Every structure is written in structure tokens, then in C-alpha cells.
Design goal:
The PDB classes it as splicing. By secondary structure, the protein is largely without helices or strands. The protein is 0% helix and 0% strand. The structure holds magnesium ion.
RNA sequence: GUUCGCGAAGCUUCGUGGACAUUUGGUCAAUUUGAAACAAUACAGAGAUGAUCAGCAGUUCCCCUGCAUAAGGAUGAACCGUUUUACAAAGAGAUUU
């Protein structure tokens, strides 16, 4: 059948889409720091 | 045109030097030939497995709907096929020098 297992994943870079994702929206702009 | 000065005619009118203001818009030009899709007809037609059916993924130089990192698309699409060598060692028989 085609109900099939696998060998490897992927990572290929295209031109960015420019879509306004919900999570990507700004939040926690301030980074904290340590004392020293 | 505005005007601030000069020179001629009768504050009114011509002739001049300046100052003011200064380069728009087009990745495009209006019907077939620079690329939309559904639909329709005809023809078939539904994942495993015997059959019926659920859902989830996975790979991809396939996308669509979706605000979407939800979710959904025929289990969304194509995958179901082709598949003969890093190839050596031992034994037996045969023709050629
Ligand atoms: Mg289904």
C-alpha cells in the first residue's frame, strides 16, 4: 500500500510569504537580564 | 498675472530692469494573441481487508479552502510500479598456444 513509513524529513528555504500570523504578533519586547 | 524701480505721452496709458513662482505623471497605455477558474457532455469511479467504515500521520520540483502554528480538503493530490554488478572463492569438464 501507500500507508507508508519514512526515511527522512526536510528543510528547504523559499521566498517568505508576508502573512500576519497570530502568534508571530509582538509580545514581550522587553527581555529580562541577570544581576551581574 | 502680482508687483518694486527707471524712461516717454496725457494720478491714467505704453516701453523696459528686477523680485515673486519655477520640470507633473507611467512596473499600467482601450476586444480576441501572454495565459482565471468552475460548469457541461462522454467515459469510468471510491485506503487497508474478504467486505463495510473511522481517524491520524508520512514523502514530494502539487496545491485549494481556511485569520490560522485551528480545522478541513477523494485516507485532499501523485506514492500501489520498476526490481540482473562495491560481486569474489573452491571443485569438475571442454576448445585455442
Ligand atoms: Mg474521508
Amino acid at each position: 500500500p501507500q500507508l507508508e513509513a519514512r526515511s527522512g524529513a526536510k528543510a528547504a528555504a523559499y521566498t517568505p510569504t508576508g502573512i500576519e500570523h497570530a502568534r508571530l504578533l509582538p509580545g514581550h519586547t522587553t527581555l529580562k537580564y541577570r544581576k551581574f
